[PDB]
Design a binder for this molecule. Structure first.
Ligand code: ADP
Ligand code: ADP
Ligand code: ADP
Ligand code: ADP
Ligand code: ADP
Lengths: 353, 353, 353, 353, 353
């Protein structure tokens, strides 16, 4: 029916349903569905629930201004939430990027912290490191988040959606990282271990965890890893665990102008001279040296990243080019039984496809 | 020394000191000095003090999103603070006004609520009504006010001024109205009085207070007087007092397009039919019928108003033209022993100078 | 003669001579006169001389693309020259700065490397540290510098100035740092000393030098000090000397967004835990705690900085505000016999005047 | 399958492969393949090879700033390379052409020297003159070419392409003309011949070569032929050869405003009065008087020319119109046994199609 | 006191009074004062008076849409009022003139009808012709004029000026021409006279009047004189009078492109062949041939014309240049006892000063 009334009717079926799909996309996102990870989705519902019952995510007192401790309805801290528009460069929305070079010393993209945060977790899972607490992109509305004067006043009047939902403040997008319990700043424990050495079996464990951290931080090329920035959990009377937690500043789009800037702080630790174990070599090498694994990972990051309103294909390629370079270096250092310290000394490479 | 080296040196004395004055004006304002009213200034210091000791002005739960209960260091509520940039139209700063007509149904100016608030108090004092709690333009900085993401992050780092002041968040300008104790919504009491009439002596008092309210609300042509909006204080075992408290929406720049919109809600009360007393006639008439009193008042409002960044001489004339018209009507109704109700029925006049 | 023919003639004396001064300013700068330091000026003449005789400054092979080893007519390396327009952000000349915020993660100004370079030397002298080899702002023309295609072709034809000078390529402005002989990367020596400890008297010397480095790097808040970046000279059969040499990335305009980025690399050395000596306390404290010394230094930097075409008063204040903050911290740590390591741990302060 | 799923899939086959073709076009060009002339391609590989082994094309000392002597890995000069962006008007890239007339005295196009250079060779081959050394459009990257500050710094970091190529500096496009050995400035020999006349047989040879030069220079209407600009090779104890070498300024788009400007310098030589031989008449006439030969040549030049980013169809027609006019004049002078001198005296014609 | 406090105070006397003068100029104009002609001013007051008492100027039924019959309070027609903004090209206010040539066939200025109207009267008086009824530039406000929707609604609300004037609609500027009684279309009478000739004495009178018309229409170069356009008053049982009444389209800025367009319609009448009398020659020649009279007249028109908001000095010169040309021709034809018909046949001249 190439030019017939039967087809022109079908084209109008598609037209109006595609406009129905495009109208109701924002509501579909703000629903927070994770078919692929029900355990996480549960914790989000729990977060949403305490919000209704009026137990509000509270600002983190000593950290940044942009991060919140999400509480469950009982009162327990269950997650950390960092909203996109509460990041430092949260303004500058009318993308002003193409106007700038058509620059600069900056090596990170402008306002995609929450996506770095989420992407770190995504690389973690793909590599099976389990050091980054599951963290995903999530919508949340709360009295305690930083809204604008207009946003607040608009929201005093009763509003209803249509499925007769009440509408509070506009939900903010951000990273929602699962909170983990009984951990401490890596350096706190690290210096105690210096005073008291650990039983060699336990210490062998700490070292396996630490290697995983190195791998993760090298691939995403974290910009901001201190030794206060990862966490160690350790209880004596016997397991020891690390948690990689502050990954808002990774996935740069070029290696920094000077090598000295943005160092990996763990590279100065004595642990860093210990050559990579076999355990890490056959957990990681089978993956990162398969071109399909890297191809598949790149695409996972593409999907996650595109979500952002400000997404730029040009940037994403630059970002991936850096990562490829890291993967390359890492592969080498893994094949030659080198150590984390050796790895950070290898000259940075970019790989263009 | 009209073109000599002795004078050219004196001109450079003036140049650099006038630039020193213009540099350090913002710090001079944010200091909150009131030579003319030390009692008020004291309460501001007290507000500033609790801020340092970490007793923060808290958001008013049931009212608007833009208003805060300032507390003293003890915990007592001492003032209401409404910041300019937390008003509904707080955005729209790059004055976009001349671009609009060179409009509209709107009869109030855009973002000068705090000045209406302050101006109401200023008219109160000039007329000696003492129904508006002293309220002035004040700078305050606090964790609990609504700042932007940038403003917050910028302020985590230690900053010092130079007289080695610490610098918190940037101080906000707004209205700072003295809080008054033991009052209730005018209509709460008003309906009780209907059930229980008041002793005629007390009732005569309520009526004197009420006349003052009428006068104030008519001259500034309040846009937003409900009967929940003014307050009555009354304790039995014998004085009764009114408080005019929510004057953010007065000093319009034209009479509203339709007379029916923005009514004075007290005009429907039975009290409003009672003709103006002698007490009010010789408290007000000697003032508002002296052209110099009005001239002097206009200039007080000019000085207060100009403070605003968005101030517009064109608007201020329109504003004053309306007020003159009200004063005119009021003068008439006062000379002819008319009642508040009669007064609100008189056709609105504008007076152009 | 306020409006007379005698004065109008004098005003024309000034008009045409001020236009003569403004015409011939560029030639006056490109002359490289240093009344205040004849020893340096000599070395510049020597550099200019080898240029004529065709001994060309050669590109530094392993470093950056923007730096040249200036040779005397004999062949000896006598200076390092880094031209402004060969810096990384050398383009972007039509100042596009005000168009950007009226940003950003960048904490250094755009294209003022040569001035940081020169300013470091200027702070050195003022404090009498003598660890930075004298370095000033200098004009040089050479075949080997990176010119544009036009600049090169234009310069094949014979040109003459008028004092019948020949004109080669257009002279470039940059930093001209005196070359120092027999030094090596600080870490080269530092690790040898670890194998072989130094005689305690010599080692006490190394420590006095090192303190000076700390002081310099903290005040200008160098962004880019590695342990390959300063140099140690040491000959055994007994003095030891440091040279602070790569100061192109100091005088930031804000403390970096994250404390972890741009660390001072010497802070990890064991030397850094040794508390500040008396020798440094009475060489520096008498200076940096006199408000006039700081006032005088600020003005020296102002004069040097303004030279740049892109200079911005707004930036320069931000820059000075940072430095004041450093001076403040430094003063404290010097009074309390603290160590360099303690000093870098003190929270960064900004001081606004 | 005009609107079916089988076809929509095929359209996506084309879409993504055409985008793959368009992505990887620049890499395809920078490869320098000449199926049609393997002997030339070889010399390019040889040039590329010495570049890797670090034998760099060196600047031509006495000529222009834009030309380089390409060396093979042995050290021998094998080619002359003139990059497009090192031509005099190499800037002005954002084509600013249509903005200019919607002018001027200029009769050559702005920045297509390398194409004139290449086109001269292309006309040579088509006419079988063999006086222009084979010269084609070629990409080359080298330390010694004139790059920008950014281009240089960007290229210090290791980069890799993906077929795991290393990436040096960005390759420049230009003309790559085969270097020819043992030649001298035409006038050098020409004046010696005046002192010593040549054996009449040899001299008859010189004259056949010279006619070919005339033909070539007249058709492309070279703008810049001196008598230092073509070369004669001559060895006594017996052949003599000319080489037409500097053809960067031909293919004008109009005849010059004044006939006197841009003369053909050989027209003043005594040789120029000698009428065209039969040898040239039946080598050239059979060609240039066949309309198909001219049609075919025009299309060869079209293909070569379009390569340029700045190409303009409007200009190319004007260019071809001039050439047609020359061909016309030339045909005439060839039919009537006229001499080169007669030919240059014939009034310039333009032929529009 | 050239730079003293005594003078700076006097300069502020001038500043604020000159701003007082400039503020209250519009009110000063809208007052309609004619010191120089009290008889006219009276009739304006009378017009204003009937307006208040609600006897409104009524639209002229058969003429243009822009003209009104002003009535006195009794009901008698006393004047014709043509408002500027009711002319055909009344829009186009934001002068768009300089944007047009930096054109055209149009030979009149855009929207200055009322000034032509007024200027005709002004030329009449200066020459003492007394055929144009006194007409001046006048402000009037009336319900019946054509106002905009906004103008009307704005004016329902009571407004007062400050000398406690009420404010009706905004007053319009226009021409206010005295109405004259018992006249008829010139051609009505003219054709009757053809049937009945007039007594020769009366006819001699008609001819003197007619000459005056010719003079007036030629000098201002009326564009639009029909024979219905001037009026004759004639009563039998003995004077006869003409009235020149519709002069809205004179003072062109160039002679029309074609001579045939805009003819003087009286030129076809038989009267027009009768040579100019002595009476007109010594009433006009003594004037128009004195250069000072013309100089003085030009300045009177300048003053009148400048009033217009759209006034343009460039145009006014062109206008005066045309008139000078007419005066020149007229002078000639008056000296040589020529007739009106001869005069209109003389080629148009422009005279530039
Ligand atoms: N997923 C997590 N589980 C447990 N503790 C966390 C987690 N994320 C952050 N923290 C802790 O909470 C605080 C939050 O700060 P962080 O998220 O690192 O950003 P910043 O310090 O820049 O605000 C830190 O003390 C950190 O140790
Ligand atoms: N100066 C004051 N003294 C005492 N009570 C006040 C004062 N101002 C406001 N209130 C009370 O506090 C609440 C604040 O609301 P208000 O200032 O009227 O603005 P909104 O209701 O629009 O937020 C009201 O309940 C009012 O009764
Ligand atoms: N003033 C100086 N005296 C002696 N050696 C120097 C001096 N400046 C730099 N060098 C040395 O020369 C090289 C130049 O590099 P440098 O100026 O540090 O910048 P980059 O390494 O970024 O090019 C380094 O090896 C350094 O050790
Ligand atoms: N293809 C070639 N073969 C041999 N010699 C050449 C060739 N091209 C140029 N030369 C010689 O090398 C020098 C290069 O200059 P040229 O290419 O003519 O441009 P310019 O003189 O404008 O730089 C000249 O001396 C010329 O004689
Ligand atoms: N000053 C005047 N005195 C007497 N009658 C007039 C006067 N002006 C106009 N009229 C008459 O009133 C009518 C008005 O028309 P007029 O002013 O000529 O312009 P239009 O015909 O274009 O509207 C005409 O009939 C004219 O005869």
């Amino acid at each position: 029916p190439l030019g017939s009334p039967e087809f022109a009717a079908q084209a109008q079926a598609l037209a109006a349903q595609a406009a129905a799909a495009a109208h109701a996309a924002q509501a579909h996102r703000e629903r927070n569905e994770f078919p692929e990870d029900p355990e996480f989705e549960a914790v989000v519902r729990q977060a949403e629930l305490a919000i209704e019952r009026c137990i509000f995510p509270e600002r983190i007192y000593q950290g940044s201004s942009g991060s919140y401790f999400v509480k469950d309805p009982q009162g327990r801290i269950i997650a950390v939430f960092k909203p996109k528009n509460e990041e430092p460069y949260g303004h500058l929305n009318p993308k002003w990027t193409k106007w700038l070079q058509k620059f600069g010393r900056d090596c990170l993209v402008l306002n995609q912290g929450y996506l770095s945060e989420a992407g770190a977790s995504l690389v973690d899972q793909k590599l099976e490191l389990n050091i980054v607490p599951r963290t995903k992109v999530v919508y949340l509305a709360s009295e305690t988040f930083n809204y604008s004067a207009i946003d607040r006043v608009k929201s005093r009047g009763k509003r209803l959606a249509l499925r007769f939902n009440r509408i509070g403040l506009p939900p903010k997008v951000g990273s929602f990282q699962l909170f983990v319990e009984g951990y401490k700043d890596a350096d706190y424990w690290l210096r105690r271990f210096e005073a008291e050495p650990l039983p060699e079996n336990t210490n062998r464990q700490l070292l396996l965890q630490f290697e995983r951290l190195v791998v993760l931080d090298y691939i995403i090329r974290n910009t901001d890893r201190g030794n206060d920035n990862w966490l160690i959990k350790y209880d004596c009377p016997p397991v020891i665990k690390v948690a990689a937690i502050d990954n808002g500043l990774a996935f740069p789009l070029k290696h920094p102008d000077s090598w000295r800037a943005y160092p990996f702080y763990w590279a100065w630790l004595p642990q860093a001279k210990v050559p990579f174990s076999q355990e890490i070599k056959d957990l990681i090498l089978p993956k990162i040296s398969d071109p399909n694994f890297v191809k598949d990972l790149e695409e996972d990051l593409y999907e996650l990243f595109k979500k952002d309103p400000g997404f730029d294909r040009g940037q994403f390629h630059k970002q991936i080019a850096v990562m490829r370079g890291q993967i390359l270096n890492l592969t080498q250092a893994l094949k030659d039984n080198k150590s984390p310290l050796h790895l950070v000394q290898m000259p940075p490479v970019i790989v263009e496809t």
